[PDB]
C-alpha cells in the first residue's frame, strides 16, 4: 500500500489486511470468513547510513479463505478460529458457524 507521495518503496500490508491488485493506495480489509497468515510482512528498514530502504517482503496476495470446520466472525484477522461445539462449518470460507 502507499497512502502518501514521494515514497521510495511502498510498505507491505500488515498481516490482517491483504491486497490483491496492483498499485493499491490502501490495503483491502480481510472480510469476515477468511484470514491472512504471513511471516515476512515487515515494512522495509531505512538504514540511517545511506537513507535507503531494504528488506521489504510482500504480504499475502490472496484472501486464502478459512478451511472447513474453521470460521472467522471478525474481520482483519490473521488466524482462523475453530467452530464451537454443537455447530458445524459445511464449506470453507464461512463467515460464521
Amino acid at each position: 500500500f502507499n497512502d502518501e507521495f514521494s515514497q521510495p518503496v511502498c510498505k507491505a500490508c500488515w498481516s490482517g489486511s491483504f491486497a490483491s491488485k496492483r498499485g493499491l493506495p490502501t490495503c483491502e480489509i480481510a472480510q469476515p470468513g477468511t484470514f491472512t497468515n504471513v511471516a515476512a510482512a515487515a515494512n522495509a528498514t531505512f538504514n540511517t547510513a545511506t537513507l535507503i530502504p531494504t528488506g521489504l517482503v510482500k504480504g499475502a496476495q490472496a484472501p486464502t479463505p478459512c478451511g472447513m470446520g474453521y470460521f472467522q466472525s471478525s474481520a482483519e484477522t490473521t488466524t482462523c478460529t475453530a467452530c464451537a461445539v454443537g455447530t458445524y462449518a459445511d464449506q470453507a470460507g464461512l463467515a460464521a458457524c
Binding site: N37, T64, C80
Partner: protein, 33 residues
C-alpha cells in the same frame, strides 16, 4: 490452493419457508395418525 500457513425479499421468503415447514409438519402429523 493449499491455503495460508494457519431485506424486504429476505424475511418475506424466510417466513414462507417457515410456513412451508409448518405445512410439512402438519402433513406428516396427519398421515401417521
Amino acid at each position: 490452493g493449499g491455503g495460508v500457513n494457519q431485506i424486504l425479499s429476505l424475511m418475506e421468503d424466510e417466513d414462507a419457508e417457515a410456513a412451508q415447514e409448518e405445512q410439512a409438519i402438519v402433513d406428516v402429523d396427519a398421515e401417521m395418525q
